[PDB]
Structures are given as structure tokens and as C-alpha cells.
Amino acid sequence: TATLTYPFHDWSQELSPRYAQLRASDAPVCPVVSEGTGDPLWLVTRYATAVKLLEDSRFSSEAAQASGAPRQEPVELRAPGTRGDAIAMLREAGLRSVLADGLGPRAVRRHQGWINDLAETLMSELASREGTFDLAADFVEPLSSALVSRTLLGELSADERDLLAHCADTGLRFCGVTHEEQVHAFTQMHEFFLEHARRLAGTPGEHLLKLIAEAGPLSDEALAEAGSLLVVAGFPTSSGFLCGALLTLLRHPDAVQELHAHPERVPSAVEELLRYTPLSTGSVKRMATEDLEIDGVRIKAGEVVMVSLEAVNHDPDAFEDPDVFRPGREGPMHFGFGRGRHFCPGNRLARCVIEATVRAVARRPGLRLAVAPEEISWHEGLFFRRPRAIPATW
């Protein structure tokens, strides 16, 4: 119909041209319809409007997560007949800040050493390789697997890691699998944690699931909900983003040569990667809890307004030459971690692993993509973009 269906099927790093067109339209908020549900939605693509949306106390993230809310995802991101309200259930137990606490600056100071050791071990192994090697399978996968075990869930076996990763990939999708396969992915996840979360939380370590369990005691359902939250929020984001960041670096050898010569510039390159490299193929979303206007557009209570972080991060009103990867950039704050109350509580740990990845690349001149960027294959339909492989050579 004449109402755009959402999302825009831009599964590779090439952002859908529709975002820029909506950004330059006369409307600061554009009505769309969810392809997966037919629900009406509003879409924001301008930085200035997105700031207003994500800092407005009348827009509720949790209300947009509730069952029956208009939504972009085809299947609800909860197990059948469960609350799907992990952050609120943690706060109910009196754990208001455990996620930020276990992922903040002190946690980076605990984990940054081994994270950098491992990035270096993995890249040193690749430096010994002949011919073409795969940066997704042989760098991103082992690094993100270690991140998950050591910081989020506890020591997982290869089979457990494989199962949770498959559940995330299958459930967090707009298309490419059946409805039944999507629901089953969340089931295997929830039933996995109902059985194993107590065991995982009880093993020695600093992992977040232990911190949650060991801080009326927490029920197995709340602890299982916490496990599924950590998988959904932590696994496909880290693997998708690290893959995409590697692609960005390989496509910008001049920038990498600068980082090789001036390693103190790496933190700024991390921030530019967070702005430039696209991640989600949908939008962050909030529900209006009362009638309001945003930039003149009237929104009724109950309606859901979305912001594409990719669109905002590429807004020329905010970032001059927004489609240029410019590590020296000194523009406004990027939206890669969101904005306001729900700003990514994993942001410091994520920055730590991105930095370690950038340094591992910058230290080794000659690394290059083995084929043209347009020949990279992409997992079609994931919420969190990820290439199937990153073939590279020296």
C-alpha cells in the first residue's frame, strides 16, 4: 500500500536509501506499518528529533515491550506465556543496578587484560596463516564466545555456546525461518536457563549471571529471564558489531595506517566505528504513555514511535559528511548505544572489546579483505546484521 512497510530489508552494510529520503521529508515523524504484524508505527530518522524522543519521560521503552503493543518483530521476544520483563523483575527483587554494576568501569578493569590477550592470541594465529582466512569464524567467534562465558553467563561448553548462539540467530529475525522455529528458539533458551542457570551462577567467576543470583531470594524464573536477557542483549550485538567493525576497518586502509602509526588515536576510532558501522536492521522503540506532540506531530497514548539509530548516526544535520569514516571526527555524541535512560549498560565492556579488536588490526599492516565488499555474504533477516564470513589475506 501507500504506507511504507517496515523494516527496509537492508541486511548488508548498505543502509536502505529510504532512511535518507524520510530524513529530508517534511515530516519529523513518518507513519509506517510493520511487515511482520501489520501494526501501525511511527518512524524517526533525524538526530534532533531522536534526542527529543529518547529523553522524553512520556515515552516508555517497557510499555513498547509489552504483549499486544504494536511492534516491528514478527514473533514476540518472550517464551509463550511469560512476562518477558527481565529488567523490571530484577528491580522488583531489589536489584535495581546489577546490570550496570557488573558491566561498568570496574568490570572493564577486571576483564580488559585477558580481552586484549585473547585478541592478540587470535590475531597472532592468523598472522601465521597461508592464503585466505575467515575473520568471522577465527577471530570474532572465539572472542565473543569468551566474552559471553567470562562476563555474562559463566563457563559454557562448546555445545552450550553453540545452542544459545543458534537460538539468538533464529529468534532475533524479521524473516528467513518459520514462525515455529522462532518460537522454539526462545523455548530452548528459556528451558535451557530454567534448568542450568543455577548451576552456571554457582560456578566461580565474575560473570553477570552470578552477580544477579548472589546479590526473598531470586526465583528460578527470574534467573532464567535474566539468562535470556543476557543472551539476547549481549550475543548477537557483540558478534554482529565486531564483524561489521572489521569490515569498516578493512575498507579504510588509510585510517588503519594512521592508527598503526598513532595508537593513542584508537579510542576515537572506536567512537567513529560506533557511529559509522550499522548494526540493527530495525529501530529502538518507545510507547507514548499519554497524548503528546514531538516536533509538532501529535502522538496518541499507546502508539509506538521508533528511531533508526543508523539513520540518526548518518544525519547530515548532525555529522558533516555523515557517510565518511572519519576517526578524527569531533561531532556530537553518536547513537550507537542509544541515548537517555536506556543507554546501553554494556557500553563500557563493548567499547573495551571493540578497542582490543581495533588495536589487534592496527598493529598488523597488510591485512585486507580477500574479495570486493559487495561479494560478502550476509545472514539475511537478522535483527543484528552479520556477514556469513569475512575472507581476508595478508
- Nearest residue (beta carbon) to ligand UYG: 282
58 binds ligand HEM (CB under 6 A): no
Question: Per-residue x/- mask for ligand HEM, residues 245 to 284, rule CB under 6 A?
Answer: ----------------------------------x----x
Question: Given the complex with ligand UYG, which of 149 and 237 has the nearer CB atom?
Answer: 237
- Give the residue among 193, 192, 196, 172 at the shortest CA–CA distance from 183: 172
Instruction: Please state the closest distance from residue 56 (CB atom) to ligand UYG, in A.
Output: 17
77 binds ligand UYG (CB under 6 A): yes
13 binds ligand HEM (CB under 6 A): no
Instruction: Please state the closest distance from residue 307 (CB atom) to ligand UYG, in A.
Output: 8
Site for ligand HEM in 66-85 (CB under 6 A): none
Q: Tell me how crowded residue 155 is: count the other CB atoms within 10 A of its CB.
A: 14
How far, in whole angstroms, is CA 111 from its chain's centroid?
20
Judged by CB under 6 A, how many residues of this single chain contact ligand HEM? 24
Instruction: Please state the closest distance from residue 198 (CB atom) to ligand UYG, in A.
Output: 21
Q: Tell me how crowded residue 46 is: count the other CB atoms within 10 A of its CB.
A: 23
Q: How far is 224 from 161, CA to CA, in rounded Å?
A: 16
Q: Are 296 and 28 contacting, i.e. CB atoms less than 8 angstroms apart? A: yes
Q: What is the DSSP string of 227-295?
A: HHHHHHHHHHHHHHHHHHHHHHHHT-HHHHHHHHH-GGGHHHHHHHHHHHS--BSS-EEEEESS-EEET
Instruction: Please state the closest distance from residue 65 (CB atom) to ligand HEM, in A.
Output: 8
For residue 392, report the phi and psi dihedrals to the nearest 5 degrees.
Answer: -140, 160
Helix axes 220-250, 266-276, angle to 10 degrees: 100
Instruction: Please state the closest distance from residue 375 (CB atom) to ligand UYG, in A.
Output: 26
**Order of strands, edge to edge, in the sheet holding 391-393?**
133-134, 391-393, 368-369
- Helix, strand or coil, per DSSP, at residue 45: coil
Judged by CB under 6 A, how many residues of this single chain contact ligand UYG? 20
**Of the residues 6, 139, 241, 319, which one makes contact with ligand HEM according to CB under 6 A:** 241
Whether the link from the prior residue into 267 is cis, omega within 30° of 0, is no
350 binds ligand HEM (CB under 6 A): yes
Instruction: Please state the closest distance from residue 85 (CB atom) to ligand UYG, in A.
Output: 8
Question: Given the complex with ligand HEM, which of 322 and 346 has the nearer CB atom?
Answer: 346
Question: Which distant-in-sequence residues (6+ apart) come within 8 Å of 66 by Cβ?
Answer: 287
End-to-end C-alpha distance for the chain, whole angstroms: 49
Question: Given the complex with ligand HEM, which of 43 and 349 has the nearer CB atom?
Answer: 349
Q: Which helix (H) or strand (E) holds 307?
A: strand 304-307
193 binds ligand HEM (CB under 6 A): no
Question: Per-residue x/- mask for ligand UYG, residues 288 to 317, rule CB under 6 A?
Answer: ---------------------x--------
User: Binding segment for ligand UYG among 110-118, 149-157, 226-234, 265-273 (CB under 6 A)?
Assistant: 226-234
Question: Per-residue x/- mask for ligand UYG, residues 257 to 286, rule CB under 6 A?
Answer: ----------------------xx-xxxx-
Residue with grid cell 542483549, as numbered in its chain: 233
**Of the residues 349, 360, 369, 382, which one makes contact with ligand HEM according to CB under 6 A:** 349
Instruction: Please state the closest distance from residue 131 (CB atom) to ligand UYG, in A.
Output: 34
Which stretches of the chain bind ligand HEM, using CB under 6 A?
61, 87, 99, 103, 152, 229-230, 233-234, 237-238, 241, 279, 284, 309, 336-338, 342, 344-346, 349-350
